[PDB]
C-alpha cells in the first residue's frame, strides 16, 4: 500500500517570507509586517485537493488547478522532512503550476488558498509523486523601415495526452531564446528577430527526451514579399 506525508508546520513556518514577499510586492501593501501568514495556525480538511499532475520530469512536476479568484499555495511533502520544503505559488485566474524536485524521493502535493492578507486555510490532500519528435516550421518576413523575420515552429505529438515541453533556440546571428510549454493539445513555438540566410538550431526537450534540430532561415527569393519588394537578379 502507498503512504501519505502530512504537512509539517515546524518547517512550513519558514516559507512565510516567500509567501509574504510574493504577495507584498504583488498586492502592494503599505508594509510587509501586515502579512498575517501563519503555517502553524493552519489545519487540515477532509476535502481532497482538486489538483492534477499533468507532467513530471525527474527534476520537476507540472500540474493544473481549477481557476481561483484567490492566490494558491502548493507544497511537496516527504517523510523525513529535514531539508527546506519545495513549494510554488499560483497567481489567481492562472491554472498551471510547477514544483521542483530534489533527488529521487516520494512526495505528496498539498494545496491551499490564500487570503488577501495571506491567511492560509486548511491544507487539502493531493496526489502522490514518485522516441524522437519531428519538427516543421514556417517563416514570415515583415517590413518596417528595414525588414524582420518571424519564425513559428511546430512538431508532432505521441499518442499520450500528458505531455509538456522545454524549448531552446539559437541562431548564428540572433541571441538565444528559451521557453517552457505547458501541456497543450498541439505545442507551438514562436521565434522573432531572425534574419535571412542564417544557420539556426533548436532543441526540443520532451517526454521522449531531447531532440536537437538544426535548420537554416530561408533566402529572400524564397520569401515572396522579400523578393518582390527588392531588386530581382
Amino acid at each position: 500500500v502507498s503512504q501519505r506525508y502530512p504537512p509539517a508546520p515546524g518547517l512550513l513556518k519558514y516559507l512565510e517570507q516567500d509567501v509574504c514577499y510574493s504577495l507584498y510586492y504583488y498586492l502592494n501593501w503599505t508594509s510587509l509586517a501586515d502579512c498575517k501568514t501563519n503555517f502553524e495556525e493552519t489545519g487540515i480538511s477532509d476535502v481532497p485537493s482538486t489538483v492534477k499532475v499533468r507532467c513530471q520530469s525527474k527534476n520537476s512536476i507540472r500540474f493544473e488547478t481549477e481557476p481561483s479568484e484567490h492566490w494558491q499555495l502548493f507544497i511537496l511533502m516527504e517523510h523525513d522532512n529535514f531539508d527546506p520544503i519545495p513549494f510554488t505559488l499560483i497567481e489567481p485566474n492562472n491554472v498551471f503550476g510547477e514544483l521542483i524536485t530534489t533527488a529521487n524521493k516520494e512526495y505528496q502535493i498539498w494545496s491551499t488558498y490564500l487570503d488577501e492578507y495571506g491567511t492560509l486555510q486548511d491544507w487539502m490532500e493531493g496526489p502522490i509523486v514518485l522516441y524522437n519528435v519531428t519538427q516543421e516550421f514556417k517563416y514570415i518576413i515583415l517590413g518596417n523601415d528595414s525588414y524582420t523575420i518571424n519564425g513559428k515552429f511546430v512538431w508532432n505529438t505521441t499518442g499520450d495526452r500528458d505531455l509538456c515541453f522545454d524549448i531552446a533556440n539559437i541562431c548564428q546571428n540572433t541571441n538565444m531564446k528559451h521557453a517552457k510549454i505547458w501541456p497543450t493539445a498541439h505545442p507551438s513555438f514562436d521565434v522573432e528577430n531572425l534574419v535571412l540566410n542564417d544557420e539556426c538550431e533548436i532543441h526540443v526537450k520532451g517526454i521522449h527526451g531531447t531532440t536537437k534540430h538544426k535548420y537554416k532561415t530561408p533566402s529572400c527569393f524564397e520569401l515572396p514579399e522579400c523578393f518582390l519588394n527588392n531588386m530581382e537578379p
Binding site: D18, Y21, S22, Y25, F87, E98, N173, N175, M176
Partner: protein, 86 residues
C-alpha cells in the same frame, strides 16, 4: 594571419552585483579590407539587487530571490575580422 589583436579590460558594475568585476576583450592593423576588425558582443547575466520593481528581472522563477535581480549584459569578448554585417 587574418586576426585582430584584442585588449582586455575590467567592468566594475558596482558592488551590488554578485559578479562584480567583468572581463571585457575590446579590439585594442593587419587583416586589411575588405575585412575590418569588429568587436564580438556576447551577452552575460549579472545578478544585481533590491530596487523598486524596476524592469523585469530575467526569468528566475521567484522563490528565494527578488532580494536579487538578474540582468542581461552584452560585452565585447573578442575582436573578429569577418566581413559579414557591416
Amino acid at each position: 594571419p587574418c586576426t585582430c589583436k584584442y585588449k582586455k579590460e575590467i567592468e566594475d558594475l558596482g558592488e551590488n552585483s554578485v559578479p562584480r568585476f567583468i572581463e571585457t576583450r575590446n579590439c585594442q592593423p593587419t587583416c586589411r579590407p575588405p575585412y575590418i576588425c569588429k568587436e564580438s558582443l556576447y551577452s552575460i547575466t549579472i545578478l544585481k539587487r533590491r530596487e523598486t520593481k524596476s524592469q523585469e528581472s530575467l526569468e528566475i522563477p521567484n522563490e528565494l530571490k527578488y532580494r536579487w535581480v538578474a540582468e542581461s549584459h552584452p560585452v565585447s569578448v573578442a575582436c573578429l575580422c569577418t566581413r559579414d554585417y557591416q
